[PDB]
Symmetry: D3
Subunit: 149 residues, 6 copies
Amino acid sequence: MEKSFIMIKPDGVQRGLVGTIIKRFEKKGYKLIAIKMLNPTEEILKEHYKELSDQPFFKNLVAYISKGPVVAMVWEGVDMVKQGRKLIGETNPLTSNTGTIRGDFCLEVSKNVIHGSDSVASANKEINIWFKAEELTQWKHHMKEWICS
Amino acid sequence: MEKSFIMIKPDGVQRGLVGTIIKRFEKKGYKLIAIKMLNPTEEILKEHYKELSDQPFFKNLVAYISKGPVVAMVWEGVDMVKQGRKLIGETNPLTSNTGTIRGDFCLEVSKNVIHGSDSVASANKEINIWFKAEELTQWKHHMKEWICS
Amino acid sequence: MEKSFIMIKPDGVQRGLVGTIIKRFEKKGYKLIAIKMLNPTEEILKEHYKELSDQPFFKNLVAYISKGPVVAMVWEGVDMVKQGRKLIGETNPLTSNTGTIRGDFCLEVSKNVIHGSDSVASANKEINIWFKAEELTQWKHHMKEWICS
Amino acid sequence: MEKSFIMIKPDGVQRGLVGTIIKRFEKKGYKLIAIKMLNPTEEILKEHYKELSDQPFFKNLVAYISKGPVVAMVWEGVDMVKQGRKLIGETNPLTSNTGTIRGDFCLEVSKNVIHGSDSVASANKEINIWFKAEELTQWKHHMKEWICS
Amino acid sequence: MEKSFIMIKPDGVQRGLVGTIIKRFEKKGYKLIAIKMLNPTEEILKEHYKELSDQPFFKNLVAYISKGPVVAMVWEGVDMVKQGRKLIGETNPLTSNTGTIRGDFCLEVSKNVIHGSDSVASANKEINIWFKAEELTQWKHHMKEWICS
Amino acid sequence: MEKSFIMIKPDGVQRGLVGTIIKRFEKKGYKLIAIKMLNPTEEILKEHYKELSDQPFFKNLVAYISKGPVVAMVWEGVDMVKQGRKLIGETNPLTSNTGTIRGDFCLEVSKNVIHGSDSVASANKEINIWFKAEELTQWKHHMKEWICS
C-alpha cells in the first residue's frame, strides 16, 4: 500500500507532541511501519530538502533541524500521502484549518512541528533517504479488515 | 425536536470507537433518546438500502453488516440531521474534513464506521424501522436550558 | 467469558458521561455485548435493588432512578466483574481513588453516575432482569487475540 | 505582541468548558496574560456592547450576561485576534466548522459559550474596559523560542 | 459550601497545564468561584508561606513565585479541601499516585505545578490573603442538582 | 540522567496504543532519547528474557512477540526506572491500579502491551542489547528547567 514520510520536527519534540501526533495518525486507521529518533546530518538534510534547495531562506533551515531532535516515521495506508497532508494542514499554520496538527498547535511557518510528504513521488524518495529497507518493518495489521476492504 | 438515526457500523465497534463517537455527540449538546446493540436481520437490514439498491456494491454490504455488531442510535436536538452529517463528514473519508468522525478515523468508503440520516424524511423512516416507539425514551434534559432558547 | 452489568445512572446521562464511560471500558480491552436506554419501571428496579433493600433510604432511591434516563449495559471479558468495580471505584466517591469513574467525576454517594455488579452471582441475576437473552449480541472481537491468550 | 480579549460566557462556565477552552488556547502556543471571574456590571456590559444598542433586545442581553458567571481573559501572541476567531468559529455554531469551540460544543447563537474580539482595534478597546493595566501580567514564556522566530 | 484555595504555580503555567488542571476540577463536579492571574507580590507570598519562615531557603522561595506567573483560584463544593488534595496528590510527585495532577505531570517537589490547601482552617486563611471578598463571585450552578443531594 | 528501557509489545501496536503510551510518558516530563520499530530476532529476544528461563512460560512468549511488531524505546529522567514501572503498573493488569497503562488498557498477563525495566541494573543491560550507542540521541530538553532543579 501507499507509504508516506512523516517527521516530527525539533519543535514538535520539544513541545511534547510526539505522542499526540502519533495518536492522531493511529486513530485514522493508519499503519506505523518505521520510527526512529536521530539528530540528522546536515548531509541527510541536504538531500531531503533538495526540492527546497530553491528557496531564499535555506542557510537557516538545514542547521536548525540538524541541531534539535527529530522523530522520523513512515506510515502506510490508502491515500497515505494526501491524508497525511490533510492531517497536518497547510504550510502556514495561520491559514491551516482547525482540527489539523498545524492548525491546533502551531503559529509560525518556521516552527510547524511536522513534515509531511507532498506527493507519492516525493514520499518514496524521502523514505529511501531517511530509512534503510531493513528498518521498514512488515507486520499484519489485525484491524485492517475493519478499516479497508 | 428534530430526531436523526445514527448507527455505528461493525467496523466502528471493532475498532472501539463506540465511546468516542457518543462523546462527540454528547459534547455537541445533543440528546441520546435511544440506543441498542444488535446483529441486524438480513431481512430487516434489506429495507435500509431499499432506496439506494441501484448501486453496484449492494450484496457485499448486506453481508459485512449483518454479521458484525451494530450500535443503533437515535439522537434528538435542533438541526439534528444536518449536524449529525456534519459531525460524521462526507461519504468518502478521503474528501471528508478533519475534525469529523470519518475524517479522524476512516480511510475507505466501505469501512466508514458510522451511518447518519441524509434528510429529515429519511430519518423518520429509518427510526421507525430500527426502533419501536416504546424504545425511544422520554426524558427532560437538564442542560437544554443552557444549549437552547 | 465473564459478564458484568454496568448501568449509567440518570446523573451520568445528565452530565454527558455516557461516551466517556464507555470509552474507559472499551480502552480496557473489554467487549460491549448489550446496550439499551430505558426509563426503568419501579418493578424492574424493585428486583435489581432487592439485595439492597437492606438500606434505610430505599423508598426514595427506586423513585429516583425510575424517573431519569438510564443506559443499561453488559460487558464481557476476563475478570469482568472485579475490573469493572475497579474502573468504577468505591461506593463513596470521596474515598474512591483517582483514575476511577467515581473518583474523577463524583462527589456524593447518592449521585455516583454508575452501577457495577458486586459479584459474578449478582451479575448473572442483574443481566437476566435487565436484558432479554435475544438482546445479548454474539460477535467475534477481532482484537481479542491481542488482549487475551 | 498582539493581544485579544477572550471571554467565556455564562453557558460556557455552566457546561464546565472553562478548562477545555483554555487548553485549546494553550496548545495553540498562545500566552495567557490575564484572567478573572466576575459577574459583569451593567456599566461594563454597556460599554462592551455599545455597538449593539441598535437592536430590539438589548436590555435583556446586558441582563443575561450580567446574571451568569463570566471568565474574562486576555491572550497574547502572533496573529492573536484572527487565530482566536478561528479557534472559536463563526457566530452561528451551525455554520461554524468542526474543530472549533462553537462547532464542537454549541448549537444556538444565543448560547455560543465564548466571545472573541473581531478586530485588533476592537480588542484593545475590549481589554481596557474589562481589565486594569495592573491586571495584565508580564512574564517570559519559556516555550516562545520554539513557537516563534 | 466548603471552599479551597488552589493555585497553579509558575511551572504549571509554563508547561501549559492551566486548562488541563481546571478541566480536572470541573469534571469532578466542583464550582469555580474565583480565578486571577498575578505575579505575587512579596507581601502576599510572605503571608501565604508564613509557616515556612523558620526554614533556611525562604528568600528564594518567595522570589521564585514572585517571578513566574501564577493562577490563583477558589473552588467550592462538598469536601473541597480533601478532594482537592486528593486530585493534586502527595507533596512528592514520586510517591504520589497516578491519576493525580502531580503523579501525572510532575517529578520534583520543587516543581510540582500546583498548591492545594491542607486544611479547611488553612484554606479560609489562604483565600483571604489572595482574594478580596468582591472577587469571589456568587452564581447558581445549574448542575449541582445532579452532583449533590 | 537515569535511563530506562520501555518496549511496546505487539499487542500494544495492534491496538493502536503507541501514541497514547508515548503521550503518557511525555506528559510526566520525561525525555525520549531513542525509539525504533523492529521485528525482534530470536537471538536478540532470548537474551532479553534470559533470567526468565526458570519459568513455565518461556517458549510461548517468543512466539507471540517475534512475529508481531514492537516499538523499542529509551526514556531518560529522574527516577526513570521506578516511575516507568509506576506508569506501567503491576505484571498482572487485574491487580494493577487504575491510571496505569496496564490498569487502563489490559486484562491478561500474556497481553499487557508494554515492558518496563525492573531495576537500573536491568535497564542498562536491556538498553545495550536493544540499541546501539549511536542510536541514543543527545539533545537539550528545553523544558527540563521547569521539571527539574
